[PDB]
Symmetry: C3
Subunit: 136 residues, 3 copies
């Protein structure tokens, strides 16, 4: 029970970044598909760990042609753990994708941040998900 913890969120439209998102560079997901434990904060697109354990995260951030390459980082309490990268071309939607397992303590925060480049043109089809693999 207290060890069933999972979330899943997607970007459902190609609408543009909000003003606050330009300031945080935190990547926003409007449609929450799964939120067992209610530990993902959808306003802030941030997972907050309810207990000590090993957590898994995956993300795929989709961009269109927009005169920019990007770097996306999964952030743990404001420090980048992993990054992914995408280029700039008009042939196809393209994704920055990566995933990892990390230890988190209670209250630890995980979210995605655009380190380099921007998502003007939208980031429809973007995904972010994660779950407690086991408590420690």
């Amino acid at each position: 029970g207290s060890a069933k913890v999972a979330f899943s969120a997607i970007r459902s439209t190609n609408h543009e970044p909000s003003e606050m998102s330009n300031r945080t560079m935190i990547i926003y997901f409007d449609q929450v598909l799964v939120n067992i434990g209610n530990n993902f904060d959808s306003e802030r697109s941030t997972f907050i760990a309810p207990r000590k354990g090993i957590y898994s995260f995956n993300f795929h951030v989709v961009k269109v042609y927009n005169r920019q390459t990007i770097q996306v980082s999964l952030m743990l309490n404001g420090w980048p753990v992993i990054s992914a990268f995408a280029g700039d071309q008009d042939v196809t939607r393209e994704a920055a994708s990566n995933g990892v397992l990390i230890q988190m303590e209670k209250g630890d925060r995980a979210y995605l941040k655009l380190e380099r480049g921007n998502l003007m043109g939208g980031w429809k089809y973007s995904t972010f998900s994660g779950f407690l693999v086991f408590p420690l």
Copy 2:
């Protein structure tokens, strides 16, 4: 026991799409590596959920140069949950990859569908896998 549910499948050759696959646009995996619970239907390349829970899925669909870009969607009972994308070039094999967690009920179906483009030239090296994270 009834909560150990996992599958894994790959495309082992670069052979071309069958006639029926042209009609469904459902992506076929010939080699099943894991099938605990026997809940993946290999003929139809479809996972059928044996019980209510949160399930994880991952896929990577590999294409060669074939004058087409692709969009691949994970389908839940015929509705696309996530998509991934790949372009068209002759430099390298390229993948449409994405993954997500979703709630499924008993009898719910998960499979992959080519929404845009085709896989003439084969989709060798393609992978699809998933598992019950926990029952609900």
Copy 3:
């Protein structure tokens, strides 16, 4: 307890391949983020399964422009289970990414091998992780 098994490793610098790595073509990860059970051998960048079960693996191998395309394979006791691919360009860091579930027996070994191409220029930002989904 004996069913909590997880690792996570990354490549933290853009330093070049060592001589021994040129001989094995085994991809090395210097920073180990998670190692529950201590079943990942960091010197050899190899996970050694402590018991029979279904294990999940994910990897993303990041390259720079280096006049080479690559193929990366997850190896199970020296045989490639899945592969991923990346091309060669100077626009952006690019990744060969894939993931899968496999059955392993006790003592089985999982590691990543560069089947085609090389990682001159470094493979900073590369990731490799995996966990026991359940014992069998």
